[PDB]
Amino acid sequence: MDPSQYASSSSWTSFLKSIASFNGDLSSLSAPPFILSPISLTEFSQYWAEHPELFLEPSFINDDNYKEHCLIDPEVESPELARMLAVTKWFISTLKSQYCSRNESLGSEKKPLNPFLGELFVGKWENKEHPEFGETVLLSEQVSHHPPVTAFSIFNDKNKVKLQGYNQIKASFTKSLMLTVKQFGHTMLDIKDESYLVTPPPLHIEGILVASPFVELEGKSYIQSSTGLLCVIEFSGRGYFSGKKNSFKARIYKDSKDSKDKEKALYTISGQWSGSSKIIKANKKEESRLFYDAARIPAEHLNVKPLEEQHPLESRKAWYDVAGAIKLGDFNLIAKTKTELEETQRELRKEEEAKGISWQRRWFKDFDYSVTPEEGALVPEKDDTFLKLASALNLSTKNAPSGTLVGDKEDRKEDLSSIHWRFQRELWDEEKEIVL
Numbered sequence: 001m002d003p004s005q006y007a008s009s010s011s012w013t014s015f016l017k018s019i020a021s022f023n024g025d026l027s028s029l030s031a032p033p034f035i036l037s038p039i040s041l042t043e044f045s046q047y048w049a050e051h052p053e054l055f056l057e058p059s060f061i062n063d064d065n066y067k068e069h070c071l072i073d074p075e076v077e078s079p080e081l082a083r084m085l086a087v088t089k090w091f092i093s094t095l096k097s098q099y100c101s102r103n104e105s106l107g108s109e110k111k112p113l114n115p116f117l118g119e120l121f122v123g124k125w126e127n128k129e130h131p132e133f134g135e136t137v138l139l140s141e142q143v144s145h146h147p148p149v150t151a152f153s154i155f156n157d158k159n160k161v162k163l164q165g166y167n168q169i170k171a172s173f174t175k176s177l178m179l180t181v182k183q184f185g186h187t188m189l190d191i192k193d194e195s196y197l198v199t200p201p202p203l204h205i206e207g208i209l210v211a212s213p214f215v216e217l218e219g220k221s222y223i224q225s226s227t228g229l230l231c232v233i234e235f236s237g238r239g240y241f242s243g244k245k246n247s248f249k250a251r252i253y254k255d256s257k258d259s260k261d262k263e264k265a266l267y268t269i270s271g272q273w274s275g276s277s278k279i280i281k282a283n284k285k286e287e288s289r290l291f292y293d294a295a296r297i298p299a300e301h302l303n304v305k306p307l308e309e310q311h312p313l314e315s316r317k318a319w320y321d322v323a324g325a326i327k328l329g330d331f332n333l334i335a336k337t338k339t340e341l342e343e344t345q346r347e348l349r350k351e352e353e354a355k356g357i358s359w360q361r362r363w364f365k366d367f368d369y370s371v372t373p374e375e376g377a378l379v380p381e382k383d384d385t386f387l388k389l390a391s392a393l394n395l396s397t398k399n400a401p402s403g404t405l406v407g408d409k410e411d412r413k414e415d416l417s418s419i420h421w422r423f424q425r426e427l428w429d430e431e432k433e434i435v436l
C-alpha cells in the first residue's frame with residue numbers, strides 16, 4: 001500500500017496493539033511487511049567508517065604538519081588536539097550513516113533483521129582513488145543472539161588505524177508509544193600508538209503512531225583519548241531543550257577533570273549531525289567556522305563480494321530468501337522463509353544444549369573484566385587500553401548502559417557483569433575460509 005495508508009491500516013493497528021503487551025523482545029512484535037527492512041543488524045557495523053578520508057585523517061597528522069591538518073584552526077595548539085578534532089569530526093560523520101540511512105534508502109526507519117548467532121558480514125573500502133589510504137577492512141560478527149550482540153573491527157593496516165567494538169541494546173515502549181533505546185557497549189579507535197574510547201548515545205524512535213519511524217538521539221557520547229583530551233557530545237532535538245532536529249553540542253576539554261566546567265572547553269561545536277555544524281575556539285563566539293556539513297560529503301559504501309562468492313555464514317547470502325520475500329511484501333513467504341532459518345537455528349541451540357556443546361565465536365572472544373571473573377574466561381592485560389581510558393574518563397567498566405560513569409545509579413546495580421567482546425586479530429590472520 002501507499003505510505004499514506006500505513007497508519008490507518010488493519011496491519012498497523014494490530015501492530016500497535018501488540019506493543020501494548022510487548023514482552024521485552026522486539027522480535028515478538030507483529031511488525032507488518034511494509035515496516036520490515038531486508039538488512040541485518042550485522043551490517044550496521046559498516047556505519048562506523050563510510051567516510052574513508054575522515055576515518056584515516058588522524059593518522060596523517062604529526063608533530064611536523066599538524067597545523068596544516070586543522071582546517072577550522074590553523075593555530076591549533078598541538079598535534080594531539082588537532083587529532084582529537086579530527087576524531088571528533090569523524091565521529092560526527094558516522095551519525096548520519098548510523099541513524100539516517102534507512103530513512104533515505106527505505107522511506108523511514110524500519111525493523112532490521114535480527115541476526116542469527118554466528119552471522120558474519122565482511123567487506124572492504126578499497127579506496128582506489130586514494131592510493132595513500134590503502135585498503136580498509138570491515139569484520140562484523142553476531143557474537144550473541146539471546147540477547148542480540150554485534151561485534152566488529154574496521155582496520156587499515158597501511159596507516160595503522162584500527163577500530164573495534166561491540167553493540168547491544170535494551171528497548172522498551174513508553175505509554176505514548178515512544179521506543180526508548182539504551183545502547184550498551186563501546187568502541188575503541190587506535191591511531192598508531194594513540195587511542196580513543198567512544199561510547200554510543202541513548203536514543204528513541206518516534207513517529208510510531210503515524211507509521212513513519214525515525215531516530216532521534218539524546219543523552220551524551222564521550223570520546224576519551226590516551227592523550228588525556230576528552231570530547232563530550234550532547235544530543236538534543238525537537239521536543240527537547242534546543243528544539244532543533246538532530247542537534248548536538250560537543251565540547252573538547254584538556255581532560256575529564258576540566259569537563260566538569262563547560263567554561264574550560266577548548267572548543268565548542270554546535271549544529272545538526274545530519275547537517276551542518278560550526279565550531280568556536282575558547283570563548284571567541286565572534287569567530288566561528290564551519291566544522292562539518294553532512295550534506296556536502298556523500299557516504300562511501302564498502303565493497304561486498306557478489307552473492308555467488310559468499311560463505312554460508314555471510315549475512316546477505318544467509319538472509320537472501322527472506323530479504324527477497326520482504327522486498328516482494330509477501331506475507332506468507334516472509335513468515336515461511338524467516339521461520340525456516342530461525343527454526344533451523346533453534347534446533348541447533350537445542351542440540352548444543354543437550355549435547356553439551358557451545359557455539360564458538362569466530363573472530364571475537366568475551367573478556368571478563370570483573371574483579372572475580374569466571375574461571376574459564378579470558379581476562380584483560382594489565383596495560384589494557386579500555387581499562388586506562390575508562391579510568392581516565394571515570395567510566396564504569398560494568399555492562400551498564402554506554403557512557404555510564406562510576407557511581408551513577410546504573411553502575412551501582414547489584415551483581416552486574418563486566419563482560420566485553422574483543423577482536424582477536426590473529427583469528428582473522430589464520431582465517432581459512434572467509435575472504436574479502
Ligand SMILES: CC(C)[C@@H](C)/C=C/[C@@H](C)[C@H]1CC[C@H]2C3=CC=C4C[C@@H](O)CC[C@]4(C)[C@H]3CC[C@]12C
Nearest residue numbers: 026035044098099109110111112167181205213
Ligand atoms: C517498528 C519499530 C519496532 C522499528 C522501526 C524499530 C526497530 C529498532 C529495533 C531499530 C530501529 C533503529 C535501529 C538502530 C539504528 C542504529 C543503530 C546504531 C548501530 O551502531 C547499533 C544498532 C542501532 C542502535 C540499531 C538498533 C535497532 C534499532 C533501534
Ligand SMILES: [Pb+2]
Nearest residue numbers: 206216238239
Ligand atoms: Pb521529539
Ligand SMILES: [Pb+2]
Nearest residue numbers: 365366377378
Ligand atoms: Pb565465554
